[PDB]
Amino acid sequence: IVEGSDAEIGMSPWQVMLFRKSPQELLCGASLISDRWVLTAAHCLLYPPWDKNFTENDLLVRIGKHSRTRYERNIEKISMLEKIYIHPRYNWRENLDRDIALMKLKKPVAFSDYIHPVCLPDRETAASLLQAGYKGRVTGWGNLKETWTANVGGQPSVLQVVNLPIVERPVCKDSTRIRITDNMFCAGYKPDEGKRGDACEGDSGGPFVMKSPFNNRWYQMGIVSWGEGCDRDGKYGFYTHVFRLKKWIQKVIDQFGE
């Protein structure tokens, strides 16, 4: 996260870390949406340009973490993966269209002060909160600045958080040459808006969330998907439109129990 700040304890209890077993590194962010279902970007699991094609056994997830580095004794939890599900119409060749994937935990995780699922948006919530100018929240353990390894196959000690405004669709389109689809939205400040902030390398797959004024519940509206660099003037972060792919999500989940 660029130009964000230290998250508070338990501020984002649905935050999930995606790890490679061997060699041991942090790959992507993710989110807990039930006691056994984790949500992330498809390109975290499958991206052929970078020889990326992780199976279940390659990965484990860490839930309820705050520090990137230190072990949190009776706070954080290590979960294994039973099955990986990537959107069948996911398109990595062109624009990361439908950049979304579900991961099922081998065993259900137990909820705590630090581990708790985020809500999936319904139409009403999606209709109300998905408006330009309205702000959502992005969290992750990614880089604090854009590095030379960006968009190619320092770092915070604790979880980072930034709030960013949803951007008007035509502005998003004019900011990039990539064909954007309505399975995406983009967020971030405009050059003359003064404020700054963006997701960065390692924040991929993490949650873009918004708090409903109607029921005080946090809803995940987006997944950190792609962006040209980090926190560049005139560029914006692009996010997987969760509600527009919710039908797929539910279909996967209903066949193997939430």
Partner: peptide
């Protein structure tokens, strides 16, 4: 494409 282009993921960070």
């Amino acid at each position: 494409a282009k993921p960070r």
